Design a binder for this molecule. Structure first.
Ligand SMILES: CO[C@H]1O[C@H](CO)[C@H](O)[C@H](O)[C@H]1O
Ligand SMILES: CO[C@H]1O[C@H](CO)[C@H](O)[C@H](O)[C@H]1O
Ligand SMILES: CO[C@H]1O[C@H](CO)[C@H](O)[C@H](O)[C@H]1O
Ligand SMILES: CO[C@H]1O[C@H](CO)[C@H](O)[C@H](O)[C@H]1O
Ligand SMILES: [Ca+2]
Ligand SMILES: [Ca+2]
Ligand SMILES: [Ca+2]
Ligand SMILES: [Ca+2]
Lengths: 121, 121, 121, 121
């Protein structure tokens, strides 16, 4: 993969990948593992989000991509998706701001840059 | 995607994709969603497997690929993996045989054939 | 390949690949072989164009892609290029209109649809 | 691209790309341009080989890939081909040994490592 690493659930600023994406690039992502978004026995989340026996608001406690401070859904993974903005790829466990203190665990994530933007001319 | 569809947790024989894979092909898979592998409130599973607060034996209640009656790990997804055997791709919720009766729900899965085998000559 | 076939040099309307493309798709192409754009011994062309010892105007007697009646350079090939317009992919030996009658031969061309447009959201 | 650069026709040892390939990787290549394999006005070659109005023996004056001192056809390009041996990718204008002194020009070549070997398990 172009980047592989952990995404800690307690990282409020996310995990920086160092991948500098440009508008028009395409990427794929797969995310593995489990994290806690709280201390309770039920407050587990996959990258796709909280276990549905304790659901949270939309996009909360899911794996998202942050690019130029805009957030995009990733969850368990995405295949060959076009990047609409420039910026470094930050992978973020999208917990409510200020509530990362009771989080633990990390996802294992792989990112592939499938293509760099170049149009037909 | 080359194939997108549901993989029911209660399907003991899995979900046939119709994709005929050859040794040397490469594929990518991403799987989303939640299933129950039992009627208890804790018996939830992501494609990666059971929620860790109620763990099961290795590979049980995970999403796997069946090709020529061999099983391969898939879970939440894989990127650009080489197919080692010829056969139709079957996607299977790998519950213990005979225990699919209390399963429910389905994963949403996407499969892409990234390349068909062709060697440098 | 998603499409493989011969592109005749004397086909003033090009060769249909049957591939229906959408803006934002990415494609790769490789083209092999040799054609004649005239009866003279010097009037050979690779997909990239005429041999430089008998140059023709820009883009003339080169392999191009025709989509929605717009022309894009292909030549010997392109890798993971973004498609800017919807339409059927036509491959065309871009000879001067009305001068296809003295052409002969065909390029062997392979086309791969690397991805179908799907943005991060 | 993973590597893009020039392949001089007069480089008897070829052009080292620095790409370290492993058995099972897949690669794509496209090659553009024209070179001379001799001082005569007719001794032009595309990556696919000599212009057919002055043909040479089979495989001579064609663009090939050298991996572990073995030669593989490339010509104008290849798409998603599996690498059969470990080694650095060397791109070579395959002229007769000792006859590179009368060559000039260079091909413009792009190489993409489409995937790094990882099997389903
Ligand atoms: C409802 O509380 C739980 O979920 C929220 C997010 O909605 C926070 O993560 C909090 O730490 C956790 O205990
Ligand atoms: C421990 O029981 C639970 O898990 C097993 C597999 O380990 C079966 O799926 C069963 O249906 C479910 O109730
Ligand atoms: C100089 O003429 C040559 O090139 C032109 C295109 O410019 C036509 O293909 C013509 O048939 C061919 O003989
Ligand atoms: C027949 O001569 C020509 O072709 C051979 C290879 O076949 C050599 O490249 C030589 O330099 C060139 O002049
Ligand atoms: Ca929290
Ligand atoms: Ca069960
Ligand atoms: Ca002509
Ligand atoms: Ca020579």
């Amino acid at each position: 993969s172009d980047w592989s690493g952990s995404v800690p659930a307690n990282a409020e600023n996310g995990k920086s990948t160092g991948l500098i994406l440009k508008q028009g690039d395409t990427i794929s992502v797969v995310a593995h593992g489990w994290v806690k978004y709280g201390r309770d026995n039920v407050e587990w989340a996959a990258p796709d989000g909280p276990v549905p026996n304790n659901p949270q608001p939309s996009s909360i406690a899911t794996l998202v991509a942050k690019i130029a401070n805009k957030k995009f859904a990733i969850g368990n993974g995405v295949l060959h998706k076009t990047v609409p903005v420039d910026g470094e790829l930050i992978l973020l466990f999208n917990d409510v701001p200020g509530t990362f203190g009771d989080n633990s665990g990390e996802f294992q994530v792989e990112v592939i840059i499938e293509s760099r933007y170049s149009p037909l001319k």
